[model samples]
Target: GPMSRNDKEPFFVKFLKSSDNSKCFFKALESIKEFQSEEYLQIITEEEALKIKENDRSLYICDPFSGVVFDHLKKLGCRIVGPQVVIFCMHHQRCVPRAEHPVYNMVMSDVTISCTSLEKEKREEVHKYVQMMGGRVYRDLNVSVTHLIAGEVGSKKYLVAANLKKPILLPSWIKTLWEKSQEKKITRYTDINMEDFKCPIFLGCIICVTGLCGLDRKEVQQLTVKHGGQYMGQLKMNECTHLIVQEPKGQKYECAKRWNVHCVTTQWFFDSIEKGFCQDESIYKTEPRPE
Candidate 1:
């Protein structure tokens, strides 16, 4: 039911009568970061106001400006945002249109995710991924949370979401959902399994290649990307730790020798990829005897 004149009368009259209550309303608006923006407006359309009300949030946007509640606000072309009498000019400023780019409207638009298992740095990476996919991130769990992403079991947020019967998911779900976006419907939570964190062999080691090896430069680049290793073609004397090559004879090789860079043969690259781990460079070292 639309509010009667009486329903709107109380809050407006009460606040307008007391400076303290008026201060309270203004204070809450200040807490909202965009409240002070000149481009941002405080009033919304009557139709849009009803939509927020339908979302189960309370709003009282009618007043003595006219005889009827809806008609009064409708005449004004605006209404307050929510429980607070704060104005929200989401679509008010014609100078700045509110249409979003198409990518934002697709798939998981506006979904909120909270992660509990990952560290702060890793969590930030996940946040960026979700934002690119058109979702939001929150630090704590609440009624607004659409998903709880975690790694291993046993975090408090993980347990809370489970107890509340909310959607508890793994970080791998982000990729899974993205790949299946074209499908009519994604598989349910039962089909998803948390990913096991893989420790990359060359996690910290920087690798560079020189002197034609059995593997092409492209092959070496692909292997490095696939196994989480950083690759550069030039053998950086100051920074290069591993130099892979067929013959230990080139400007790169000479620099590597002088700089004490580990000089290994092509087999070292192949062996590391084959074993899915870092292989000892010494085992595949190419010793050059003076000609």
Candidate 2:
């Protein structure tokens, strides 16, 4: 009897906002046979919606305008079914629609992408998907290019894009657009986001290590370059941004302190790598070790 109740049970659909647009979307959903049979759909306020936590079963139908609420629900491990996805599904009669003309043609329309630092195989794969999505892929970064899809930063294309202040996105930007049939904000896919581009974590940071502890000096230098950071052997106040010290008593650490350079522990590097962004220098501040 208990198992029977769970067998054909519909998903617990919750609406995060009540608006005219949502009301119309709800009506569209009701026209579908699945939502018609479901008895759990309810429109709730933002305050009430924020109270629920760790909900994986409940599919949250968020207001298209309420991106903050959508992101909050996403961070809570809840499933978010965007309004556009639902509308697209209703119109096409399929969840994952085919990459055919007039269907996904407008997804990436008016976009010109130039890829940098990507492998030949991966670049070709992205080129095929971009064309399928009605987007043009350029081999060279030029004035015509609107966005730069980068595998790593500091490349000639990346530098050019950075100087131009054009959007620099990760390869996953194309993947997400192709898979979801929607264009996410380019900011969400920028090279600065560690989750999107792991190499650029230390971009523009000139790091110097002093009195190294558990981490090998050679490895640290290599990692600095690997993650878009320049490694300096000597601590120069004019150029150095961060100083990694095992303890806060070395000559370099003292010089860093006098010059107002960020003196951080090796854990800063470790934690930054793990979290995919530079951790706060204050949080990882090195304390003077007992002599």
Candidate 3:
């Protein structure tokens, strides 16, 4: 859409002359939200829900969430991550690279697990399994022995991620702690131990929390690996509650349908969940003004 006369326009064009008698954008946002809210009622046709499998909700990826119109600028932030991983035994020739190592293609941290010595390679099978399938193995890089864990011998820090053929498990303590931490202002994720949670999860899961905190997807995956868990990635919003998802290319026309966890965002796709969605203010609290 570039033109040779682009520089002719000023840096700030506060208003644009519209072809139609459009009043303001704020009105458009509110009106569209209301329209989608009403349209959501007709999401599932009777014939569609009947043909779905008991355990399969994958058909909901079809349509745009709700019936919200998209004629405006919207933004949505996203984490750079590999598409769904497939698990299997995998191996590689590369080992830990030093600080001055020429290869910085994959910058792993000290916490990454390694099998340098017999002791270091104790969990070789686990590492080999994930590595063989092209997954990163986080390791700790301390060759010198020490009483790291209160008199315990030095051990390599590690975690696992093979593929996407498993279900995530939620540990009781992690669930309890996660619930508890929500009440407190947690400045860091280390405040919670990775050992407490398991993966292949469909749940508060954040693979990357860069802007909100220092935690990121790699750290989350490493933690999931160490605990024999799966990474569900960063959960910025829950949309199924406010709207339904659509998957048009499967057995059913709109098979896997549900709310997207993230109804709020800080990027371009913002319109996808903006005005048409409901919010906390839409709900009623039991207790209110009292004498």
Candidate 4:
């Protein structure tokens, strides 16, 4: 009965460049006993799907090649399966089972994790999932803690964990565990090397920001570190690769120009973060003001 209830849940389909093929696929789905209920299976556009609120029960059938759309769905916390994968699962009579409590059986069973520099709500969320997946969570960093989930690169716990040679992981590691339903190699999640991970946008970049207020500046620094860039408090022309400025002119801006460093606007950071890669500096370059 419970299985039948899962069968009755809605499925939304979005096939970006496969409108004709999508119809054929939908026809095939119509023949499947599980998807026979037309009301439960509807075709939707990318924009429509993006606008929908997060729903655990609704499985999204999206084009895997559409990276932006796929990422947006993940961000919205929508349950997603590739269009091809859905067909395969239907044929096998077993979709990827949504575990009521996804156990980290092999992955995190022995792990003891601590949180650092994370926002209150984020820390709570991580702790909750760690517990759900059968991992230990501690408020303080101690010898018993095996991993430190860091919100930023440099923090008391992060520094201690680094000195101790313990793994320092980004919060996204938990999200990856949840999505993949398996343990990832700790090395891939470490803050020590961004090049080893999926998005190494700023792999070799050393960045400095100028003319920004408190929160904006802090966010830029965090984003830089998170994406494998070094963030410097002061612009050192010899070492800095990029200078982010609010306005087009400043002492740092002048040094950046003289040193042939990339001088970009704050939007460069935001765009790069959104796209999960460093955007073109030429596009975000600040225009020099007239004298």
lDDT of 2 by residue, 1-291 (tens): 111133445566565555534553665465443423446656667777777766556656655534556557767655555454445445545442222211223355467888887889999988866765556778887899988787755456665676676777678778876655433433122223334532376776799887765347788899888877899888887999888886778687888888888888888888767755556666777764423
| Candidate 2: segments with Cα more than 4 A from true spot | 1-199, 213-215, 288-291
User: Who wins the lDDT comparison?
Assistant: 2
Q: Distance from true position, residue 241, model 4, in Å?
A: 15
Q: Number of clashing pairs, model 3?
A: 53
Better of 1 and 4 by lDDT: 4
Kindly report which residue stretches of model 1 are placed more than 4 angstroms away from their true locations once superposed: 1-195, 213-215, 288-291
As a whole number from 0 to 100, the lDDT of residue 219 in candidate 2 is 81
- TM-score attained by model 2: 0.35
Ten residues in a row with the worst lDDT in model 2?
96-105
Per-prediction CA RMSD (Å): 16.7, 16.4, 29.7, 16.5
> 112, model 1: CA deviation in Å?
35
TM-score of each: 0.33, 0.35, 0.15, 0.34
- Candidate 2 shows a clash count of 0
Candidate 4 residue-wise lDDT, 173-240, digit = tens: 77666455432233122322432323255656788988989999998889888878899999986898
The 0-to-1 C-alpha lDDT of every candidate, in the order given, reads 0.52, 0.63, 0.24, 0.62
Q: Which tens-of-lDDT digit does each residue in 1-291 have in candidate 3?
A: 111122222121111112221332223223323223333212233244333334221112111111211111111211111101100000121222221211111211122233322334434543433232222443443433110111011112211111211112223322343344334333223455544443222122222212222343354456533433324433323312111112123221122122223222222112212321111311221112221
What is the lDDT, from 0 to 100, of the residue 283 in candidate 3?
Answer: 26
Candidate 4 wrong stretches, greater than 4 Å = 1-106, 182-227, 230-291
User: In angstroms, how far off is 198's CA in candidate 3?
Assistant: 16
lDDT (Cα, 0-100) at 265 in candidate 1: 85
Q: Alpha carbon lDDT of residue 166, candidate 2?
A: 74
